[PDB]
Amino acid sequence: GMTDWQQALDRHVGVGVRTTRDLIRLIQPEDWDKRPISGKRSVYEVAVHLAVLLEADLRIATGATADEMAQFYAVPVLPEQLVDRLDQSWQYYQDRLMADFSTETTYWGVTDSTTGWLLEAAVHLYHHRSQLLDYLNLLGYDIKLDLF
Amino acid sequence: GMTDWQQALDRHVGVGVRTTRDLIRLIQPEDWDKRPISGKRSVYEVAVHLAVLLEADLRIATGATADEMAQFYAVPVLPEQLVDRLDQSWQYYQDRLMADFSTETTYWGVTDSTTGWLLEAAVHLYHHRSQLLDYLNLLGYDIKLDLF
Ligand SMILES: [Cl-]
Ligand SMILES: [Cl-]
Ligand SMILES: [Cl-]
Ligand SMILES: [Cl-]
Ligand SMILES: [Cl-]
Ligand SMILES: [Cl-]
Ligand code: NI
Ligand code: NI
Secondary structure, rough: OOOOOHHHHHHHHHHHHHHHHHHHHHOOOHHOOOOOOOOOOOOOHHHHHHHHHHHHHHHHHHHOOOOHHHHHOOOOOOOOHHHHHOOOHHHHHHHHHHHOOOOOOOOOOOOOOOOHHHHHHHHHHHHHHHHHHHHEEEEEEOOOOOOO | OOOHHHHHHHHHHHHHHHHHHHHHHHHHHHHHHOOOOOOOHHHHHHHHHHHHHHHHHHHHOOOOOHHHHHHHOOOOOHHHHHHHHHHHHHHHHHHHOOOOOOOOOOOOOOOOOOHHHHHHHHHHHHHHHHHHHHHHHOOOOOOOOOOO
């Protein structure tokens, strides 16, 4: 079973993940290195951050070191593995969601509860899903996907 | 007192609100009617939706009718009242956050728990905060605000 907050997170983070998966599948080959907002991440770089962040944030939450995270971020996610990678991150999140895990103060020093970290990763996901959506719309995709 | 999920929401939605307030205060007079993404809301229209959505969503959640919502959305929020309006919405949210409210199936028919609706309004806030940030960065503001 699960609590009402776990149910809420599973629902809303699952929407986040399924809609992100759909957006990634829209992306055309030509567009991966495009940077619609000069100064910011490319389409592909937004996509990779989205694909890994649900796991990254929870690893950060459980005490991963700066080097451990560098090693984590350095594992390449090629465009064809992005969905597979998102799915893996979503599974990791779901397992933490249901199991009592222990949080620790992060290496750069942010402290939050297990429940707070689970919410942080959720809103971080919606932050970057929005970014990706803005990029694709900047590129003329005119997206008509139900986001809520 | 409050539960661990209420604490998490108060923390993360409060960050959302304070950072949004800061972004709105950056916006220059000339930019309010600009539409950096052709086809989408203007800067001012994103800002107004952000200012009201924490209350709008919870009203929708408690059974507001289509006409009631039309009447709600039609109340004008002038650029100089935007922060005041956001603050009002945040207060409304905080009061619902702490008090057991009853949800009803929406008029267009979405059903969710009280806890799910409180999370929905949170992720909806982060969705549009991201949009506003992308717009201002599209307009050369080069924002250096800590968003998390
Ligand atoms: Cl799934
Ligand atoms: Cl970026
Ligand atoms: Cl981020
Ligand atoms: Cl405040
Ligand atoms: Cl829009
Ligand atoms: Cl929306
Ligand atoms: Ni991020
Ligand atoms: Ni919206």
